[PDB]
Every structure is written in C-alpha cells, then in structure tokens.
Amino acid sequence: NSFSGYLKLTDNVYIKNADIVEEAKKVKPTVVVNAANVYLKHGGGVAGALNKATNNAMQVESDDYIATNGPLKVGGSCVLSGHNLAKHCLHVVGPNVNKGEDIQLLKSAYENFNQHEVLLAPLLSAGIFGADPIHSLRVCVDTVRTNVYLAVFDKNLYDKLVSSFLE
Ligand SMILES: CNC(=O)c1cc2c(N[C@H](c3ccc4c(c3)S(=O)(=O)CCC4)C(C)C)ncnc2[nH]1
C-alpha cells in the first residue's frame, strides 16, 4: 500500500490525478475497487481497463461467480481475486443515473468500502454512470470511515473536485 503523490482531503480520504490501473500496478494494494455493473460484465470504462490489465482473467472469474451466486444488486458488492493488480478486487455497483437508477444508492455503494481497512478506488457513478462527480466525492467523504485512496484519471475533473471540497 505504498501510495504516493496523493492529496489528503480528510483523515481518511486521499485523492490523486491518476489512472487506477497504473496505481494498482505501482502500489499492489490489498484492495482495488472496480466500478462494476450487476452482471459483472467489464465491457468498457474503468471495469474494462482493470479487466484488460488482468488479460481477461477477471472477466472469466466474474462469469463463474455470477453463474453460482446470481447478479449483484445496485448498491451491493462482492470480493473476488485482485489477480496481478491487488490481493483482492471489491466489485461495487454504484447507481447508473443515466439508466434511471436511484442516486440514493450511492451511499449504500460507498458503505461497502467500510469492510476493508485500506482501498484504492475510482469515483463511484461518475463518467457515463451520470452522477454529479462533486456529489459523489461528498457522499464518499461522508460515508467511508476506512482509508480510501481515490484515483481520478482526468486533471480537469481532479482540479474541480479539489476546489469544490476546499471551498
Ligand atoms: C486505461 N485506464 C482507463 O481507461 C481509466 C479510466 C479511469 C477513470 N475514469 C473516471 C471514471 C470514474 C468512475 C466511473 C467511470 C469513469 S465510467 O465512465 O467508466 C463508469 C463507471 C464509473 C472518469 C470520470 C475520469 N478513473 C480512474 N482511473 C481510470 N482509468
């Protein structure tokens, strides 16, 4: 968990302008969070990038999990192997507001992080999931009580988030 170059926002929330895939390779954290969907189909975005970095081993493991346990619920999670990226991957489903899912489930989604002492994570429900990224950061700060290192792969969004938080 040798995270470097993060800006500490609160006692337990740190943030960096970085690609989560590159952070996972450098740090090899105990837990990396995936921004998953309920069927664990890692077809693009953050989930697609993490799967590609495991040379599709994450997708094969995920399909086997789904066959045995069924889909996740929005706001839920499951712990699977981290493969070459981390000891474990915590697949968390945040709401996709562009598909009509309830923004209130973003609190339930971040609550899953509290079962792990230290995590490397993306900003849940941001990008094409349609949530307001400044609201996502506020929910993270208000809900996560363990140590979370957020990697946001966009300098423009990183600067807006830091400015909004320090207001
Ligand atoms: C090669 N790496 C990547 O493509 C990559 C993208 C990437 C990344 N993207 C951010 C992001 C955060 C949350 C979600 C999305 C996107 S999504 O559009 O995939 C839908 C799921 C939720 C945006 C906002 C900057 N944050 C952190 N490391 C990264 N790595």
Side-chain angles (χ1 to χ4, degrees):
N1 293 316
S2 44
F3 294 101
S4 66
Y6 283 73
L7 174 65
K8 183 172 194 178
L9 297 177
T10 70
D11 283 337
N12 67 288
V13 176
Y14 300 77
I15 191 170
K16 187 180 180 178
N17 160 221
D19 176 356
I20 193 170
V21 174
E22 297 302 314
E23 286 296 299
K25 293 175 192 173
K26 283 155 166 142
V27 176
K28 320 128 182 269
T30 306
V31 179
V32 68
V33 173
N34 181 24
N37 54 34
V38 303
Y39 283 94
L40 305 182
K41 286 300 192 181
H42 313 306
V46 169
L50 285 167
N51 177 56
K52 176 175 182 204
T54 75
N55 286 86
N56 207 52
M58 175 181 285
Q59 183 71 74
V60 172
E61 177 194 32
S62 293
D63 291 343
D64 177 80
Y65 170 88
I66 290 286
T68 305
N69 302 89
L72 296 178
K73 292 300 278 152
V74 178
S77 66
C78 70
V79 181
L80 288 177
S81 176
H83 303 275
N84 50 302
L85 297 176
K87 178 183 194 172
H88 301 287
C89 179
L90 180 71
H91 296 267
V92 173
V93 184
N96 184 328
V97 319
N98 281 331
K99 308 216 75 186
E101 297 169 2
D102 186 4
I103 191 57
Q104 302 185 266
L105 291 166
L106 189 51
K107 173 177 169 180
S108 296
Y110 275 119
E111 276 171 351
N112 296 289
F113 290 24
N114 289 325
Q115 320 301 348
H116 300 284
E117 287 292 310
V118 179
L119 314 89
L120 165 64
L123 192 66
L124 300 176
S125 294
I128 71 164
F129 276 28
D132 181 329
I134 289 168
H135 174 58
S136 186
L137 178 64
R138 296 204 185 108
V139 178
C140 183
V141 160
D142 291 338
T143 307
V144 181
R145 289 187 197 169
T146 53
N147 308 296
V148 61
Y149 290 78
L150 295 171
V152 177
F153 193 26
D154 182 336
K155 174 60 168 160
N156 308 105
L157 176 58
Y158 171 86
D159 283 350
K160 280 171 182 199
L161 289 170
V162 173
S163 177
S164 297
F165 194 75
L166 302 181
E167 275 182 345

